């Protein structure tokens, strides 16, 4: 089942995705960088899972491999839920691939239709909190056009809907004018 990882928290999306992947259902998450992890920029700085001290230079020869990009976070994160250990686990992992950007131009389950939780309201809650598409910058994340442009790609998808789309709309409108 195709969802969209856009404008809410990261963990309270990851959890919901795991129970859906469980059997073998082919859930792909689209966008990782427009999620939101919490923490400061002080404690959540030095020991953080991009490049600063820990999880980039975090390897041996026969040993780990992490990331320094806001795209690769959600991919690594959902081995860290559904492990490679069990047979269904490694099978369920392959049912998920995460994408940067929004390559589908169409509107699937995205903003209005999504599961519960997700879109937390910060009022009395929340002074400090990060964003994955801020945190990964001076970590080796460049090349914004390449990844950031993806937004530009998602735009052309919208465009395809808005067409023909625009046509059936103009019609639908004339229908009610009547």
């Amino acid at each position: 089942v195709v969802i969209d990882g856009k404008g809410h928290l990261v963990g309270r999306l990851a959890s919901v995705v795991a129970k859906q992947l469980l059997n073998g259902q082919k859930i792909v998450v689209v966008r990782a960088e427009e999620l939101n992890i919490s923490g400061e920029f002080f404690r959540n700085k030095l020991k953080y899972h991009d490049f600063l001290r820990k999880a980039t230079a975090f390897n041996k020869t026969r040993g780990p491999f992490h990331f320094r990009a806001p795209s690769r976070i959600f991919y690594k994160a959902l081995r860290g839920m559904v492990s490679h250990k069990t047979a269904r686990g490694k099978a369920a992992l392959e049912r998920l691939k995460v994408f940067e950007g929004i390559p589908p131009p169409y509107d699937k389950k995205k903003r209005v239709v999504v599961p519960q939780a997700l879109r937390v309201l910060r009022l009395k809650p929340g002074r400090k909190y990060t964003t994955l598409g801020k945190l990964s910058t001076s970590v080796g994340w460049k090349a914004a056009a390449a990844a950031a442009a993806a937004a530009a790609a998602a735009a052309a998808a919208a465009a395809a809907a808005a067409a023909a789309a625009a046509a059936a709309a103009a019609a639908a409108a004339a229908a009610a004018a009547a």
């Binding site: 041996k60 020869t61 026969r62 040993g63 790609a153």
Partner: protein, 362 residues
Amino acid sequence: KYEAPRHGHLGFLPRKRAASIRARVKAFPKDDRSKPVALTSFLGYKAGMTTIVRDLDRPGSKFHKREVVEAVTVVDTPPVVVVGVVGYVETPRGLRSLTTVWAEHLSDEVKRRFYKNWYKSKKKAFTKYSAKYAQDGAGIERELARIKKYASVVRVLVHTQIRKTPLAQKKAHLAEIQLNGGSISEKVDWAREHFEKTVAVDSVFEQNEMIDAIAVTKGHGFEGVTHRWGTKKLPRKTHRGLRKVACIGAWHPAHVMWSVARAGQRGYHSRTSINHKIYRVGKGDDEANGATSFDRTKKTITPMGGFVHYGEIKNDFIMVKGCIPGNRKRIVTLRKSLYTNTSRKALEEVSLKWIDTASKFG
């Protein structure tokens, strides 16, 4: 789990053989955003050196503008011939073209080369040397290539012309070479006049920039820890441990990483040396050498005699103050420098005062 200090360079790992005789360099020196059309690298052959008796570049020196003895590799640069200017653009996958624009007439040494006719290796299929391919219709649509918006750095597949340098073979040495220039549009437009047949030497190399001296070095031996890293001997020098070393691993943990002081291949990659400052360019015959003394040996530019193991130079050379890898006979690939450190000392020529000419030997 201790450490002893860094004797030798760690990051030449793995110490892989540079199979192809010409050096390659994935991270090319980026654009001359000044010169409207250039190339990124060029071509050379390692020949020999002379002592350039000149005067200093640094003008405020204590002994400013004195006599200065200096090294110089006088490498022969015959110009390269184009097969086709490949119009690399983008697609939404990646770095993918659309068409190339061929040259009509190639060289002569295209006979034997375009194949992979060697034992225990793959072929190619029957993509031999050129018939008369896409250039007529292809030349106009490289204008439309920048109109895509999906557009990248346009490059050009080249081959050498050999015998002209004293090496007599007529099977050419291949490489692609990137076109540089002002913008993406300019390295396409002015490169249309490049694919005609042969390019210029002077487009990439302006006199008195810097030139980074990458080439293919010699494979020394299966060099042990003494020469390959830089361990000593033990002064007792008996038993087993003469030219050996101590620690490779560590107790806790048993599993270490790729720092360890073992034996294997030394040199022989496409290893890059930094900003060797270009002296002069001379087209024909200018400087000479040959002096009857011990200095360093066996590479003599127009003495009484010639060079040993090369042949006597009657071509078109570029003079790099410094050096470039290989030894005699070896074909080199001179890349240009992206970060040019010092100010360009061009316009006028650099001084040649006097130089010797005699035998090199007795």
